[PDB]
Design a protein around this ligand. Structure first.
Ligand code: FAD
Ligand code: FAD
Ligand code: CL
Ligand code: CU
Ligand code: CU
Ligand code: CU
Ligand code: CU
Ligand code: CU
Ligand code: CU
Ligand code: CU
Ligand code: CU
Ligand code: CU
Ligand code: CU
Ligand code: CU
Ligand code: CU
Ligand code: CU
Ligand code: CU
Ligand code: CU
Ligand code: CU
Lengths: 432, 441
């Protein structure tokens, strides 16, 4: 049999695939408000359901009301897919590791093979008054706000923080981003980060860099962010401090599973841990915190268990990602700073959004297009697409890079019209 | 004037692109355009851009006049940008006037202030198409009847909009005006709604349109059109229907009669189209034809590929050809839009191949719920002997983008396994291709 700890993209997908091949499965989930995983209940689906409602400038609580019915439908849906296959017991409890072989859930469960899918949890910065102060929420709590705050304060200049910054700005709120680094989006090209910042500055969002946050109070109906004799008064404070793996009260030392400093389970290329028949897929690995990467973790584990598995984590070339601001930033491959830091000489090519007629059709001609081409192989090394529907058209750049095809096939491709993917014709035609 | 090394007839997609590429290569180029409201081509002014601009506003239930106001701002910005991007190059002469073939070397441009004569070492026909008018009495004189061009310039949203034509452009206008709050009645002469598509997706499109108020009637031979008292009356077999405005969506045919191609040795078929090579060579030497005037598929990206053919001949590297075209995609811009590539299930059944047809309802795509439009369906056809994909039917929101992903691996001859295992962005509509081709046995 098999036991998977945690309703997650890899966990629920492995549980259904195992059940259809004849395995007795037992998936353990601690919350009935988390059927479907972090993505379905408090992650992508609720965040981008509201992001889509913000770019239309609809009422904020009417959109929260609608986010509540899209997550409620999907929460019932994902529990329906799991319990209506006979093999899968759904144990509504929080699991604890007794040894390699058996698990204790708050009932003790024995398993021939265990698969860890507990995901990650929000980390709090050790700032005095961060928990003692009302009006202070993380991403989950902020998604359940009862009224639109007039002034929103965000601790963190991360991708999750920029999403909510542009999301609430479109709703009608003043947003202040408090970032500690010297650069906005330090993991990005500076021409791209300059554009994102300018788009946010035009919607009222102040980007405060080198932000020193000493304490956080509550005084006169508002939250106060102390900063060495300078207080910023906001009506609600979101904290985008990133998430770290959730291997605390699993007590994974009992099973002999080595953990690194951040709490992530040390895992193999094919997702084997230190213990003999234990696996860990998803954010708990410590890798990229994406829903698609966790699904591929199921692909790696499934090939081992049900085929004969060549599948490895050394297969994932060009993992793309998107920051669902408005317009969304999609990125795959290296940046200009990375391509220049290595030996191969490159040519950078830029297409402004003003030259994309489809962006004019959709009433948002903001952002720019950018890509890097290797003059030695005519291949593509990276792309930064800051435009409407960039999350959809970046999949085309990633797929051609996977097959190692040159940039010319995108330069000469017959696309659909009018589309955003057809601007790739205009993009890679500026290459020489 | 002098003799131009290249003379292009029309501001179409291919010609306006060839003019910039030849002027940049040193050629003395002249482009003739018969209308100063047609700078930039049919698409920019009366085609894709104003149509889709309104559909995007119609999806938001925006007031019709405000959307027409924004439609005007978009067509007028790109018309002025498309004119100046040509008129600013020194080697390009944008010549207003209606061109007419005197010879295979000279043209007669018709400007009301006295004619001009223009000669060309090479001449490129790029006149596009024009509305087909069915032979129904009282269609030219009745005031409430409109073409596709005239309907996009309406001043008031008609409470009941009638469409003559079950074609793709008509269905596009069906959703657009039914989104604005109008009752629509599309009348198709054939006995099947969208007969070139599958019945399963044609049925899905009909019910999506029906729940929005669109009435679909087949077996329609309209015999007279009348204006009696403020509403257009169309008389039929045994019944009659009255609408506020009547739109003719009966297809477009090449516009060549006023070009008079016979005087240059240029052959034409009975549709009115110029006959061409796989290199877009007309029967007369040094005369090319590009775009919808060729009788080919009426898309902007096919006219763009036509420019690629002729640019590969005039500027080197031997020759590209229209024989290079395979798996040409298209999209019907409803809500949700219908995008397609490859063969339908109907054709795949008849082929006799060992096929597998997978079906995924859009209600199972979480990103479609994120956008409040879980309508439509996904379906594709897998060939079992080769593991390749023969066709796809993407009836979803943002179908016009991810259909280019399906066309990608079909051109490269890759199996369906590529899209079943690719790491797509999330949440996305392209990622559902992971779930769509997981249904393959
Ligand atoms: C605000 C926000 C926005 C995001 N946006 C995106 C985005 O745009 N794109 C993207 O790809 N990702 C995004 N993510 C990340 C995404 O939500 C997750 O990374 C994804 O769900 C990965 O899931 P997983 O496979 O790691 O399993 P998880 O879903 O992380 O598994 C956690 C589940 O296990 C349960 N669990 C934990 N411990 C136990 C235990 N001991 N016993 C029983 N059950 C337990 C939890 O209750 C929970 O249900 C976002 C996350 C957040 C917070
Ligand atoms: C309602 C509608 C919707 C459409 N939607 C789409 C869609 O979604 N996607 C898509 O790919 N395509 C679409 N099309 C098709 C698209 O508009 C055309 O296929 C595209 O513009 C290609 O045209 P062309 O290059 O052949 O020349 P055109 O763009 O048609 O250019 C013709 C030009 O030549 C000029 N001209 C004509 N005769 C003469 C003459 N004798 N002398 C001088 N100048 C002359 C005209 O004034 C005009 O400016 C649509 C068309 C319509 C009508
Ligand atoms: Cl084809
Ligand atoms: Cu997710
Ligand atoms: Cu806006
Ligand atoms: Cu069921
Ligand atoms: Cu306890
Ligand atoms: Cu037991
Ligand atoms: Cu304030
Ligand atoms: Cu102080
Ligand atoms: Cu404990
Ligand atoms: Cu067009
Ligand atoms: Cu609606
Ligand atoms: Cu001007
Ligand atoms: Cu001669
Ligand atoms: Cu008749
Ligand atoms: Cu009658
Ligand atoms: Cu009768
Ligand atoms: Cu004539």
């Amino acid at each position: 049999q098999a036991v998977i700890i945690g309703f997650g993209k890899a966990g629920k997908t492995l549980a259904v695939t195992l059940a259809k091949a004849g395995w007795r499965v037992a998936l353990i989930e601690q919350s009935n408000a988390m059927y479907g995983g972090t993505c379905i209940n408090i992650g992508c689906i609720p965040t981008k359901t509201l992001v889509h409602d913000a770019q239309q400038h609809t009422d904020f609580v009417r959109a929260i009301q609608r986010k509540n019915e899209v997550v409620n439908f999907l929460r019932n849906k994902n529990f329906h897919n799991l319990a209506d296959m006979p093999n899968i017991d759904v144990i509504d409890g929080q699991a604890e590791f007794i040894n390699n072989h058996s698990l204790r859930v708050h009932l003790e469960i024995h398993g021939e093979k265990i698969f860890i899918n507990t995901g990650a949890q929000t980390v709090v910065p050790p700032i005095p008054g961060i928990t003692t102060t009302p009006g202070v929420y993380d991403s989950t709590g902020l998604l359940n706000l009862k009224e639109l705050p007039g002034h929103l304060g965000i601790l963190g200049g991360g991708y999750i923080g920029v999403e909510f910054a542009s999301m609430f700005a479109n709703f009608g709120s003043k947003v202040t981003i408090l970032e500690a680094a010297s650069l906005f989006l330090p993991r990005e090209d500076r021409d791209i980060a300059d554009n994102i910042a300018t788009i946010l500055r035009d919607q009222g969002v102040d980007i405060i860099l080198n932000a020193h946050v000493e304490r956080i109070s509550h005084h006169e109906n508002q939250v106060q962010v102390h900063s060495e004799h300078a207080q910023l008064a906001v009506d609600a404070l979101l904290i985008a401090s990133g998430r770290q793996p959730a291997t605390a009260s699993l007590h994974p030392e009992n099973a002999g599973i080595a953990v690194n400093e951040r709490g992530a389970t040390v895992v193999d290329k094919r997702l084997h841990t230190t213990a003999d028949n234990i696996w860990a897929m998803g954010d708990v690995t410590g890798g990229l915190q994406f829903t698609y990467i966790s699904l591929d973790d199921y692909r790696i584990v499934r090939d081992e268990l049900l085929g004969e598995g060549k599948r490895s984590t050394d297969d994932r070339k060009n993992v793309p990602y998107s920051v669902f601001m408005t317009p969304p930033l999609s990125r795959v491959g290296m940046t200009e700073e990375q391509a220049r830091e290595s030996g191969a000489d490159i040519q950078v090519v830029t297409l402004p959004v003003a030259a994309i007629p489809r962006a004019r059709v959709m009433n948002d001609t903001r952002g720019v297009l950018k890509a890097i081409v290797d003059n030695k192989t005519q291949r593509m090394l990276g792309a930064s697409l800051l435009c409407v529907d960039s999350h959809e058209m970046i999949n085309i750049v990633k797929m051609v890079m996977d097959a190692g095809l040159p940039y010319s096939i995108l330069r000469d491709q017959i696309f659909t019209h009018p589309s955003m993917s057809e601007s790739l014709n205009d993009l890679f035609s500026l290459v020489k």
